[PDB]
Amino acid sequence: GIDYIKLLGEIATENQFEVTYVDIEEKTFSGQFQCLVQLSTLPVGVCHGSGPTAADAQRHAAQNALEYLKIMT
Amino acid sequence: GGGIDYIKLLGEIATENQFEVTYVDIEEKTFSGQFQCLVQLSTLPVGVCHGSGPTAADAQRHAAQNALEYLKIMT
Amino acid sequence: IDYIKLLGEIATENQFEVTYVDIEEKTFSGQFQCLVQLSTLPVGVCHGSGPTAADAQRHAAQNALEYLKIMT
Amino acid sequence: GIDYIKLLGEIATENQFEVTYVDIEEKTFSGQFQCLVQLSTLPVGVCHGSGPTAADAQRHAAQNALEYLKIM
Numbered sequence: 001g002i003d004y005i006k007l008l009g010e011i012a013t014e015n016q017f018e019v020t021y022v023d024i025e026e027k028t029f030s031g032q033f034q035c036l037v038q039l040s041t042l043p044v045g046v047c048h049g050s051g052p053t054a055a056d057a058q059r060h061a062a063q064n065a066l067e068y069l070k071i072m073t
Numbered sequence: 074g075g076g077i078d079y080i081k082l083l084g085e086i087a088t089e090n091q092f093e094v095t096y097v098d099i100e101e102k103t104f105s106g107q108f109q110c111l112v113q114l115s116t117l118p119v120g121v122c123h124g125s126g127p128t129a130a131d132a133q134r135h136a137a138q139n140a141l142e143y144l145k146i147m148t
Numbered sequence: 149i150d151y152i153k154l155l156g157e158i159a160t161e162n163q164f165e166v167t168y169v170d171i172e173e174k175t176f177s178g179q180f181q182c183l184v185q186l187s188t189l190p191v192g193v194c195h196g197s198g199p200t201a202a203d204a205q206r207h208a209a210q211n212a213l214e215y216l217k218i219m220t
Numbered sequence: 221g222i223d224y225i226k227l228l229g230e231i232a233t234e235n236q237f238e239v240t241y242v243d244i245e246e247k248t249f250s251g252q253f254q255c256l257v258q259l260s261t262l263p264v265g266v267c268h269g270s271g272p273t274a275a276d277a278q279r280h281a282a283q284n285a286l287e288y289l290k291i292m
Contacts, residue, residue: 002176004137011141015148017119021136023129028214032125035132036218037140038118038190044092047112047266048288050103057110058096062079064268065094065112067244067256069086077249091189103287111291113263120185123194123215139195142171142183 151209224282257281
């Protein structure tokens with residue numbers, strides 16, 4: 001049948017949205033599978049960090065992002 | 074044993090400002106050989122759309138169908 | 149069960165808004181489709197189908213009650 | 221040894237994005253000068269730098285932005 005997943009993909013990107021599928025584990029009352037589709041605006045910012053370990057790189061990245069948010073409200 | 078806990082602070086501030094934080098560990102190293110991480114900042118989704126079906130795939134297809142109808146209403 | 153009444157009661161209690169939108173165009177199989185929006189955070193959106201506009205709305209409310217369970 | 225600030229500027233010109241430096245008034249935990257550099261890429265890339273002088277902090281932010289542009 002009509003591929004809504006693909007069509008949604010086209011229309012969402014074309015309107016600058018991102019699409020995230022979440023499969024829910026709990027069924028409906030009638031025993032059916034449930035899915036949530038998230039529409040997001042394009043992300044705000046990508047902040048960079050580097051360090052001697054992956055942990056340090058992550059933590060430095062967070063450092064950068066804190067400062068960025070402190071400045072961009 | 075100390076220092077500043079950036080991941081926790083970033084967590085808190087992001088939350089009060091309604092952002093979600095995603096850590097991405099990068100494959101390549103810097104020139105001096107150090108690890109790289111990207112922190113991606115995104116907002117709470119505009120809409121979360123629901124779908125149900127007899128199979129997980131159907132639940133996905135119905136969820137998409139709903140999202141398309143919703144997108145029509147906001148565009 | 150009257151799902152529209154129950155959804156409305158849950159909304160007034162938990163202080164959010166419920167907006168029904170009767171989609172003018174029909175589904176691929178030619179049925180009445182309705183959309184319900186919850187002013188939750190994030191905003192919740194569910195879909196309903198049926199032989200009348202009333203049935204579509206009830207099914208949308210029904211699904212909205214499912215959505216709320218998912219999100220505690 | 222290398223002009224990172226200049227190099228980043230040039231890359232910004234040919235890729236048609238802007239580069240903005242912000243000197244942060246608070247020092248880091250260890251007491252160093254702090255700098256943020258923003259790239260008006262989509263999404264906006266943001267890099268941080270640190271040093272004994274504000275100037276070194278800028279040079280390190282630009283250098284990190286060069287590392288950043290190689291992985292986007």
